[PDB]
Design a protein around this ligand. Structure first.
Ligand code: SQK
Length: 264
């Protein structure tokens, strides 16, 4: 952290880009470089019991050096408020980019491939993301895809063994749910009360992708969504999955999807 410097001098705080984990988040300008940053501001008086989780995510983010994990720039204490500075990703979240209409399987495969590259990095570093979902996948204005909002060490994306109380294979399950979310717009059971979903996920057979989607994509989903974690493939293996190989294209193509969300 940094208790000496004054973040309100070092950064110009602009519009809020939504609420987030434990505080409000703002677009802002690093006044020395004029690069755009995301600023999360947490009132530490208003969040006693959550502070340890806050630090835990600070530690994990600071240990990540990858093109597929949102860059962390540091944190500052000003009076009661903790400022946390990350890079700003101007394309928005994958969830946002679902609004104008359905994604095609090229777009789905491209986003899934970049997520897999992030999970391969994290898992190779003996880390677990713990909250893979479309709302936690951020795109740069050039279409690069990055992971954010790590979960702490809502049920729809949770693996059954997480609910019952796991390793990196829990991220593979969440990726399967996220694949359904990117194809269909929402995860399985999204109409139901969360406490019903809490017993549905361990009780029921795994969700399947339903609709007129290609068979490789349905098999990609099925491969992720096996109740037995050891039967789930690794992220390295899924990077070679035929759905990915036959459908993913350059990430720069995803700028069309970002422009669409701007015209909507
Ligand atoms: C739209 N472009 C965009 N670019 C970047 C960000 C970065 C964050 C973010 C994330 C986490 C933390 C953080 N937190 C803790 C508790 C500890 C350490 C930490 F570093 C800090 C920040 Cl600055 C951010 O909220 N957002 C908005 C966010 O998106 C994902 C959605 N699920 C919610 O809204 C962003 N948005």
């Amino acid at each position: 952290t940094n208790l000496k410097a004054d973040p309100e001098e070092l950064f110009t705080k602009l519009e809020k880009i939504g609420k987030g984990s434990f505080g409000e988040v703002f677009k802002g300008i690093d006044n020395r470089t004029q690069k755009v940053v995301a600023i999360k501001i947490i009132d530490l008086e208003e969040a006693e019991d959550e502070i340890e989780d806050i630090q835990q995510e600070i530690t994990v983010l600071s240990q990540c050096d990858s093109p597929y994990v949102t860059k962390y720039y540091g944190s500052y204490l000003k009076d009661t408020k903790l400022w946390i500075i990350m890079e700003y990703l101007g394309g928005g979240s994958a969830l946002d980019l679902l609004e104008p209409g359905p994604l095609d399987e090229t777009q789905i495969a491209t986003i899934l491939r970049e997520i897999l590259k992030g999970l391969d990095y994290l898992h190779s570093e003996k880390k677990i993301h713990r909250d893979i979902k479309a709302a936690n996948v951020l795109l740069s204005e050039h279409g690069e895809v990055k992971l954010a909002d790590f979960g702490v060490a809502t049920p729809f994306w949770m693996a059954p063994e997480v609910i019952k109380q796991y390793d990196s294979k829990a991220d593979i399950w969440s990726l399967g749910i996220t694949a359904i979310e990117l194809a269909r717009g929402e995860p399985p059971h999204s109409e139901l009360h969360p406490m019903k979903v809490l017993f549905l996920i361990p009780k029921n057979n795994p969700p399947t992708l339903e609709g007129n989607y290609s068979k490789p994509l349905k098999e990609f989903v099925e491969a992720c969504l096996n109740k037995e974690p050891s039967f789930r493939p690794t992220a390295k293996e899924l990077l070679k999955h035929k759905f990915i190989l036959r459908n993913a294209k350059k990430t720069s193509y995803l700028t069309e999807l970002i422009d669409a969300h701007h015209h909507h």
